[PDB]
Design a protein around this ligand. Structure first.
Ligand SMILES: [Cl-]
Ligand SMILES: [Cl-]
Ligand SMILES: [N+]
Ligand SMILES: [N+]
Ligand code: NA
Ligand code: NA
Lengths: 293, 293
């Protein structure tokens, strides 16, 4: 029932406005290009005349924009209207950038919560969606009914930067895993193999890797246990054994003219893990090379 | 029923000997350290006195060793015994190294097949196992009954180097995906978060990435189609959008003191994909940067 303002009418913003309207919230919108609001107005949203009018329409302002610079640019003329309101910014950006935004919000009398939407826009309003939130817990609690309708809110803690830290760490896995599927297909296709023949196998290897990591079995790898305890017991997957394979991938890529930066990064991790004395330890010992000193 | 020689009694070799013995094959073994043969002899294997005697015991010689250099070293004294036999080498190595081994085998009158065991040793002899093979198809066919008992043989073609090319491309996905899970956990734990809290989420992200790639849906990404056709239609996952996220991961890692080589490799792929004019294309357009010219 409580009114909401949403600025940024890309695919995520449109799905959130449709969902919130369907749950009976009055929704005021604003966008750099007003034509994108027209379908939302037909569904019952109100188009604000300016960012100031948009901000003044609700106690809760949700931002879905390309980055935090877009928030500063759009809200520049509305800064004096921010006092007493809560900004929930769902845009992706560097964690320290989001922490600086919390200082700017406070300067203008606004409460600030950062969010990170973990699932695609089609999941908004369903059981599949989930969104990280961080910032003052009392603010999260005050607006939880709205955030619940968007889908699967997960409060992480009262450091504003946590939502984008967790978001970018998830995207760290996503982007790197996806790059490796393309790189592996290139390695094989350089020999003349049809890309369509091998890409499904590279995809199955991702699935198999995830199954192995999640293994149900007591004898299987316990990755979080190794990293949390600092003990990396070498079983049948040691750093020196897997590093040898990393070396063979680099030589295979070098021999076939396939780009080297990705496999050389993996080889660098294994090279330094072995050089630090962890050769007989688990490959998970690369954590001791990667982690903050 | 046909006799087999197996050299290299690490975990994979031991599982293969146990399986082949259980199917009624006479199995002759040899190992650099004879003590590792003792359990296999109790199960019914015969321990050969030398590599020459091992090779002379069977028409089929299976090698399970750390690399191809170990094959040359072990079989040096047995080279004159190789004539008329088939070597199946299941050891991992660079594809061109395996092609050079096919020349050496031919020089000594032996047929040569390369294999790549894709599943862990506990899967040997079961429906879960599968092993790539490459080399002369007539040789594969002549020994297929033995290879069938080892588990899921997959003939790839008559280029000896294919088995290890496919193996290393699978391990390309495996090692890179695993490194990203550790890197992502380090990114979050640098903020003080318990590694045991976040590692399960990084693992779930691998599973989710594999599900997305294998998507059942008609609207979902068709990775193999993009790479095979050379058409990378930009939907909601463009190279410029995902490259911006790659940039944020690099700045987050730089700010928290977490190692940069892996996220900088991903950023390098996206940077060059955008700089080549593919910014509005799918992220899969990085294939045009990675692939052999
Ligand atoms: Cl492991
Ligand atoms: Cl995609
Ligand atoms: N900033
Ligand atoms: N070689
Ligand atoms: Na924007
Ligand atoms: Na060996």
């Amino acid at each position: 029932k409580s009114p909401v303002t949403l600025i940024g009418l890309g695919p995520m913003g449109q799905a959130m406005v449709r969902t919130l309207l369907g749950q009976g919230h009055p929704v005021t919108v604003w966008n750099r290009t007003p034509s994108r609001a027209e379908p939302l107005v037909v569904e019952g949203a109100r188009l604000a005349a300016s960012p100031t009018e948009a901000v003044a329409s609700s106690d809760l302002v949700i931002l879905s924009l390309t980055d935090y610079q877009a928030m500063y640019d759009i809200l520049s003329t509305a800064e004096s209207a921010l006092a007493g309101r809560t900004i929930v910014n769902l845009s992706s950006d560097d964690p320290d950038v989001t922490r600086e935004a919390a200082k700017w919000a406070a300067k203008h009398g606004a409460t600030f919560i950062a969010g990170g939407v973990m699932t695609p826009a089609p999941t908004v309003g369903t059981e599949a969606a989930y969104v990280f939130y961080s910032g003052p817990k009392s603010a999260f609690d005050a607006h939880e009914p709205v955030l619940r309708h968007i889908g699967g809110p997960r409060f992480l803690g009262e450091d504003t930067g946590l939502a984008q830290l967790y978001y970018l760490a998830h995207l760290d896995v996503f982007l790197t895993t996806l790059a490796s599927v393309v790189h592996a297909t290139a390695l094989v296709s350089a020999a003349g193999v049809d890309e369509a023949a091998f890409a499904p196998e590279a995809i199955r290897m991702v699935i198999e890797t995830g199954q192995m990591l999640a293994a149900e079995a007591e004898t299987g790898l316990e990755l979080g246990r190794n990293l949390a305890s600092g003990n990396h017991p070498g079983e049948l997957a040691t750093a020196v054994m897997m590093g040898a394979t990393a070396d063979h991938i680099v030589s295979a890529a070098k021999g076939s003219g396939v780009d080297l930066v990705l496999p050389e990064a993996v080889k660098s991790l294994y090279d330094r893990t072995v050089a630090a004395g962890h050769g007989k330890d688990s490959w998970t010992a690369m954590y001791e090379i990667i982690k903050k000193k």
